[PDB]
Write an enzyme that holds these catalytic residues in place. Structure first.
Site, PDB file in Angstrom:
ATOM      1  N   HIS A 270       0.846  -1.188   0.000  1.00 48.84           N
ATOM      2  CA  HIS A 270       0.000   0.000   0.000  1.00 48.84           C
ATOM      3  C   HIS A 270       0.879   1.234   0.000  1.00 48.84           C
ATOM      4  CE1 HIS A 270      -2.303  -2.994   2.394  1.00 48.84           C
ATOM      5  NE2 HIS A 270      -3.340  -2.547   1.706  1.00 48.84           N
TER       6      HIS A 270
ATOM      7  N   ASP B 219       2.292   1.854   3.385  1.00 47.71           N
ATOM      8  CA  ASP B 219       3.315   0.928   3.873  1.00 47.71           C
ATOM      9  C   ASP B 219       4.717   1.396   3.494  1.00 47.71           C
ATOM     10  OD1 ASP B 219       1.336  -0.791   4.825  1.00 47.71           O
ATOM     11  OD2 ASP B 219       1.355  -1.972   2.977  1.00 47.71           O
TER      12      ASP B 219
ATOM     13  N   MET C 123       2.627  -5.490  -8.055  1.00 52.27           N
ATOM     14  CA  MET C 123       1.305  -4.971  -7.743  1.00 52.27           C
ATOM     15  C   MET C 123       1.426  -3.957  -6.616  1.00 52.27           C
ATOM     16  SD  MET C 123      -1.211  -5.251  -5.145  1.00 52.27           S
ATOM     17  CE  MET C 123      -1.002  -6.881  -4.412  1.00 52.27           C
TER      18      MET C 123
ATOM     19  N   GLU D 168     -10.648  -6.451  -5.205  1.00 49.87           N
ATOM     20  CA  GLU D 168     -10.514  -7.525  -4.228  1.00 49.87           C
ATOM     21  C   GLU D 168     -11.782  -7.634  -3.400  1.00 49.87           C
ATOM     22  OE1 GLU D 168      -6.993  -7.449  -1.940  1.00 49.87           O
ATOM     23  OE2 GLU D 168      -7.717  -8.901  -0.449  1.00 49.87           O
TER      24      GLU D 168
ATOM     25  N   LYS E   8     -14.571  -8.796  -0.532  1.00 46.10           N
ATOM     26  CA  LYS E   8     -14.628  -9.244   0.850  1.00 46.10           C
ATOM     27  C   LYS E   8     -16.059  -9.069   1.345  1.00 46.10           C
ATOM     28  CE  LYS E   8     -12.190  -9.042   5.243  1.00 46.10           C
ATOM     29  NZ  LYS E   8     -11.189  -8.371   6.103  1.00 46.10           N
TER      30      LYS E   8
ATOM     31  N   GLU F 130      -9.244 -13.533  -2.748  1.00 51.35           N
ATOM     32  CA  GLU F 130      -8.420 -13.975  -1.635  1.00 51.35           C
ATOM     33  C   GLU F 130      -9.060 -15.225  -1.053  1.00 51.35           C
ATOM     34  OE1 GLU F 130      -6.928 -11.202   1.413  1.00 51.35           O
ATOM     35  OE2 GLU F 130      -7.811 -12.504   2.950  1.00 51.35           O
TER      36      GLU F 130
ATOM     37  N   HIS G  67     -11.384 -14.704   1.950  1.00 55.28           N
ATOM     38  CA  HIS G  67     -12.566 -13.855   1.835  1.00 55.28           C
ATOM     39  C   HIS G  67     -13.771 -14.626   1.302  1.00 55.28           C
ATOM     40  CE1 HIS G  67      -9.892  -9.998   1.858  1.00 55.28           C
ATOM     41  NE2 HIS G  67      -9.820 -10.705   2.971  1.00 55.28           N
TER      42      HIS G  67
ATOM     43  N   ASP H  99      -4.717 -13.701  -4.187  1.00 53.20           N
ATOM     44  CA  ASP H  99      -4.191 -13.590  -2.831  1.00 53.20           C
ATOM     45  C   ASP H  99      -4.338 -14.950  -2.170  1.00 53.20           C
ATOM     46  OD1 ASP H  99      -3.614 -10.905  -3.180  1.00 53.20           O
ATOM     47  OD2 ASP H  99      -4.931 -10.204  -1.554  1.00 53.20           O
TER      48      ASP H  99
ATOM     49  N   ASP I 176     -11.725 -12.571   9.563  1.00 52.23           N
ATOM     50  CA  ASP I 176     -10.643 -12.708   8.591  1.00 52.23           C
ATOM     51  C   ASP I 176      -9.331 -13.108   9.276  1.00 52.23           C
ATOM     52  OD1 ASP I 176      -9.511 -12.608   5.994  1.00 52.23           O
ATOM     53  OD2 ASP I 176      -9.038 -10.456   6.206  1.00 52.23           O
TER      54      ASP I 176
ATOM     55  N   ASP J 221      -6.376 -14.763   7.897  1.00 50.11           N
ATOM     56  CA  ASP J 221      -5.134 -14.557   7.145  1.00 50.11           C
ATOM     57  C   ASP J 221      -4.036 -15.498   7.631  1.00 50.11           C
ATOM     58  OD1 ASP J 221      -6.387 -12.579   5.626  1.00 50.11           O
ATOM     59  OD2 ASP J 221      -5.568 -10.907   6.764  1.00 50.11           O
TER      60      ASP J 221
ATOM     61  N   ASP K 265      -1.115 -13.057   1.137  1.00 47.95           N
ATOM     62  CA  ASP K 265      -1.699 -11.969   1.923  1.00 47.95           C
ATOM     63  C   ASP K 265      -2.051 -12.548   3.276  1.00 47.95           C
ATOM     64  OD1 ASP K 265      -2.992  -9.807   3.044  1.00 47.95           O
ATOM     65  OD2 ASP K 265      -4.389  -9.536   1.381  1.00 47.95           O
TER      66      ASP K 265
END
Ligand SMILES: OC[C@H]1O[C@@H](O)[C@H](O)[C@@H](O)[C@@H]1O
Ligand SMILES: OC[C@H]1O[C@@H](O)[C@H](O)[C@@H](O)[C@@H]1O
Ligand SMILES: OC[C@H]1O[C@@H](O)[C@H](O)[C@@H](O)[C@@H]1O
Ligand SMILES: OC[C@H]1O[C@@H](O)[C@H](O)[C@@H](O)[C@@H]1O
Ligand SMILES: [Mg+2]
Ligand SMILES: [Mg+2]
Ligand SMILES: [Mg+2]
Ligand SMILES: [Mg+2]
Ligand SMILES: [Mn+2]
Ligand SMILES: [Mn+2]
Ligand SMILES: [Mn+2]
Ligand SMILES: [Mn+2]
Lengths: 386, 386, 386, 386
Positions: free
Chosen positions: C53, C56, C87, C180, C182, C216, C219, C244, C254, C256, C286
């Site tokens: 991102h 980040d 990406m 993406e 969710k 993902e 998700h 993902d 979620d 992950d 992810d």
């Protein structure tokens, strides 16, 4: 390879390989099975025994003469094979009379009748040598909030089980009871929906030691719960009398996939727990060959149950015996979890300055648990990639 | 209209209206709240009391001097308002030291420290007059199967609670404990995941009567369970010491919506049960004003909790008092569910030919339960369309 | 064994191994990571690239000078390692300004600002050479029914994406967009909750071929859906631009988890699908190293992602190449599923008496699908028990 | 009070009030219903029309003579009542031949037969004047990953629907198609599991404008999704051709409770959306009188569906007309959500310094959305407590 033998204690309900394939939206895809052929095919597969509902063995409403003959034929199949009958149960759900439940139906006379139906079959099951009688209250529940005062229904449920324990006590029977939890289906919500709810209910019974649980892999997974955790509390409580093995893809209708399908990793942790705890009861399969299958697929399905158990047994044993895993287990302080927290006493704890006044909270917080390396080691063992 | 008064026994955690709005993916949307202003705003709203974690009231790591002052300031707010403090709890989840749990952390020294943290705050809560101490083991669990031997962790959990009950016994305290179940989050799976699992665990404790449950509407709904049914088993077991009211849309993350949002019909059946059972403890709200809201919306949210309780109280009382509903209740044989099944005894049941040999199964099966008319009557009362 | 190489196209977000461990109920368990060290550690592990991102890489609110330096430092790490950046994405969820969403916030000026934030970072991502820009509308949704007119919010969502596609067209960029999906969290319900909903929305966009999906694993599993099925419809639609990979235990928050944990069998069917379809984009992870882990566990976790992919790749390839499986696939008529149903035309179908008037429905119904033998063969390959 | 009239456009399937009560674990609790009596009882209740599967109206395998008579009898009931038939559908799920699906069965000859079965009944439905033909692919799916190549099955699904649209085009019919999504049951996973997946699939069809969706309240709730949101995307896409109203308690088996039971608040937001969007198709009920009910309860159940719709219609209209709610809607900037984001153009946005360089992010973030007051206003209207 991975071949079952009757010593492996694998059993099946007649209703499992016997399922004709009628679902909510579909008609039968397979003819009915004589219980005798099921005993023989299962024996050929390496099974140890079979279980039954009363109405799987004697068709509902059979005359005394026919009842005698249906048992005579069944007993001869077990003699021919060496098959055992370790458990039986009452069908208190199929006939329309049970539409509002059996032991907790609102109509009193239905409840009394459900007790007479169960008591009749306990006699039979003891004759065939079952050691566990199972109760699945699949019709005990409700679809709307006003149709069942739950506290009242628990009163009725406690009376039914108290009376049943009074009966087997009065007859000198050795058989014990196992409640099978289910959170929903066919009722919108079922009473005693989980292993926990069933354990708690047993503790209010008159003679609790007579009752345990018969958890089913898929039923706890229907509520998003961790099945091995539930088994661990049942074993911690000493109430794992029986178990039902199958497979389930998360929170949806009761699938009853063959054991090992659905949540494969949870099956692995389950077998590892049953084995390391020394569970000695039957390894009972309560599954449904999908209605896409013909008779040949039914037996390949039942064969897959035992195979998948044996494969997981080997991987989990290899896991617990690997010295790298034993080193990782120490790294993650699993040994420290087994040690008592304050064997020194409350007072010693209250005065131990290293437990509060001088506890370096930040040092302890900075110690990784190393759980990922441990879990990746478990995965490598599961997949045979060590 | 529908206005709360302290007699209605409504309470709130400091952490509820105090929630700054930090979620997994977001930063705070609101400044922190002095516990004093929360006591005053809530009092203005008609609340009866407040609850707290130790670290909501005294910031973690406070010096003895500051601790004294934080309590002095708090006590003066309760005096100014008449607010009570009916319950307190320990924060054994925020600080990184608790990342693997508190009473069941793998590291022994973390478990001992978690006990000293709880014991310190029990003292405080007794001083403020709390009657219930709550334990929420939100970090007791695991994300992977090998990181926690559950039977071991239950051993440790039983020692922690046994020790805590030994402490309050040794001090003469009147306070009792209430376990708060949660199935998951923050851990992948949490131990004692449901009301049932918590009831069962209490029965293995040394002095069980000292412990009960503190169920939360949303936590049972996170496992797809019927919250009123769970409450009914808690009341049947006599272990409803405390309750947490909020709202939840089915199986997903812990939402903590204000009470009445989420599953509205289940809220109705809950209030009807609490009232008709004569539940007398606090009606505690454990909710989070969504982080979209400013301070004004926080208080409108807390006001909505009590209002929605009062509205549902009236509708449910109108429901149970309506003679049409009382006639429908007889029609559905709810009266017969309250009658004992075999007050006449096992032997009388075994000889009562009208319970098996001469039971007209088809006649009984043909009697409708009339559950839909009953439920539509309940809906009409809920919506005010009678 | 099973060792990754940059040719395997494995990538990671900075936010994954960079996650400090703050959850809804917990503080950070790990220090922040310089993006530079993450690039180096990942490179050492065999990773192919990293994603980010905007916030980040450049801390929110950085001055132009600092921004330049943060990129200079980052570019030098990719040069030193050979790491790629395939990406990037915008953070339209962390800052409180996005509490009601980004492109669909009710406040118009927030929506305009979210577009300027995205457009700024598209420039940057093109400079670093990303080929896909991802949009995760995690704040686009609502907790209550009246706060968002969904049809209006879709109008706004379509304008945002139309404008973004107008921008990259006006700049000559090659980058494409991937939505993406969710279903929920952080919002009570998120718009475009599934792969399906995202595909349908793309078809109403001005230049649809510019947009695809970035599904993902976790998700879709948050809504109880079959992830490989969803991928199959994305590939059928030609819109699998990015993916993902991670792990998820059913319907809950979620999680992950590292790829391969959670639903292990679905991971197997996913890898088999990606490989046999010839998916050529990045295999992006992810995930979140559980906050129980220190820095060493973070990297063991990321290493476990790639290993588990490689193990599953081998088992699935062995599965599709086994002649017993190819014989079983013919037995279950998977070859017949690939054949067109009526290449002969509607009219030929309408006149083909063997398709209705003379179809032996009972013969066809009696043919087993042999799905269980096929699936047991797949399981044996997964576990290495052939 | 709240009395339906045929102008309210309420319709029912024959299979709904006709459901004999056979569930996975239970036998029928009610006799079969002549379609003629259902038309009359429903007409008496204020219904507008009925729908049917082919096999609800003509028993499977009927001779041409009997077929003629079954229609003659049915047509006369509609004439006697004024009942309409706005929709029909094919049963491609009950007979065992469809055990692996209809249009996507692996066996080619089953797929061809499923097309001939559908085409025959389209003719019939056009004669009875239906305007929508529904396809529910409840057998299109799989229980295990290898039994269905999904991309292949989508190829077959696209051919079936393309062929069907070629047929009605070749006949000059006005009828349109509506796909009914369902995520699972009876198959472990069903293809096109949600409204989204169905919209996306339609866009790849040859003549997309001929097809829309027929969402069912309970089916989206079986995947934890927000039903009004899904409807909003269907209406945004212009593809709400038909709708199925019923009730569902979260993620579990397909319950088909009468409309208004289950998630009551979501029913309210649904009716508010259908009304304010001006949905003009039939308000079709696809429910099952619980098998606890006799014939009298069946009709009380169907009556409860229409009543609950009418009650919710009034509350939602009172909600949107209340000036306090209109003031709250402005407060929450719902008006601003309807305004275009950048009517001024990309370039104007790129130069508007008040959208980035001079956006006071902190001021905007500090503005509460006032969503709680808005929602509490909606609740007060729902419950009639204004
Ligand atoms: O009664 C006991 C058994 O009944 C069966 O019909 C159900 O499928 C099982 O869940 C249960 O183990
Ligand atoms: O410790 C008790 C409380 O802790 C809070 O932080 C949680 O949000 C509640 O679930 C719980 O009631
Ligand atoms: O914006 C894209 C990414 O944002 C991350 O913070 C989320 O964890 C991911 O779900 C998503 O892929
Ligand atoms: O075929 C269309 C219909 O079939 C019925 O049997 C199902 O219960 C419905 O979900 C569906 O609307
Ligand atoms: Mg069972
Ligand atoms: Mg709580
Ligand atoms: Mg992601
Ligand atoms: Mg339907
Ligand atoms: Mn089951
Ligand atoms: Mn909560
Ligand atoms: Mn995620
Ligand atoms: Mn349905």
């Amino acid at each position: 390879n991975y071949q079952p033998t009757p010593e492996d204690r694998f059993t099946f309900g007649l209703w499992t390989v016997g399922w004709q394939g009628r679902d909510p939206f579909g008609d039968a895809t397979r003819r009915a099975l004589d219980p005798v052929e099921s005993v023989r095919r299962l024996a050929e597969l390496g099974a140890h025994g079979v279980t039954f509902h009363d109405d799987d063995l004697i068709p509902f409403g059979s005359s005394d003469s026919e009842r005698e003959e249906h048992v005579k034929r069944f007993r001869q199949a077990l003699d021919d094979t060496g098959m055992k009958v370790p458990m039986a149960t009452t069908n208190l759900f199929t006939h329309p009379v049970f539409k509002d439940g059996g032991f907790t139906a609102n109509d009193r006379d239905v409840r009394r009748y459900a007790l007479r139906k169960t008591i009749r079959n306990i006699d039979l099951a003891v004759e065939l040598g079952a050691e566990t009688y199972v109760a699945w209250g699949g019709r005990e529940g409700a679809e709307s909030g006003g149709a069942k005062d739950v506290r009242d229904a628990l009163d009725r449920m406690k009376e039914a089980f108290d009376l049943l324990g009074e009966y087997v006590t009065s007859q000198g029977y050795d058989i014990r009871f196992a409640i099978e939890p289910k959170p929903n289906e066919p009722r919108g919500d079922i009473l005693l929906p989980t292993v926990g709810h069933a354990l708690a209910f047993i503790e209010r019974l008159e003679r609790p030691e007579l009752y345990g649980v018969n958890p089913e892999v898929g039923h706890e997974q229907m509520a998003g719960l961790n099945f091995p955790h539930g088994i661990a509390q049942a074993l911690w409580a000493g109430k794992l009398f029986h178990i039902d093995l199958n497979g389930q893809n998360g929170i949806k209708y009761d699938q009853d996939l063959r054991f090992g399908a659905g949540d494969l990793r949870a099956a692995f942790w389950l077998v590892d727990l049953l084995e390391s705890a020394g569970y000695s009861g039957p390894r009972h399969f309560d599954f449904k060959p999908p209605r896409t299958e013909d008779f040949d697929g039914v037996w390949a399905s039942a064969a897959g149950c035992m195979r998948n158990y044996l494969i997981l047994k080997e991987r989990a044993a290899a896991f617990r015996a690997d010295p790298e895993v034993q080193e990782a287990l120490r790294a993650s302080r699993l040994d420290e979890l087994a040690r008592p927290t304050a064997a020194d006493g409350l007072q010693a704890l209250l005065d131990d300055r290293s437990a509060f006044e001088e506890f370096d909270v930040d040092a302890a917080a900075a110690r990784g648990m190393a759980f990922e390396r441990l879990d990746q080691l478990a995965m490598d063992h599961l997949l045979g990639a060590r």
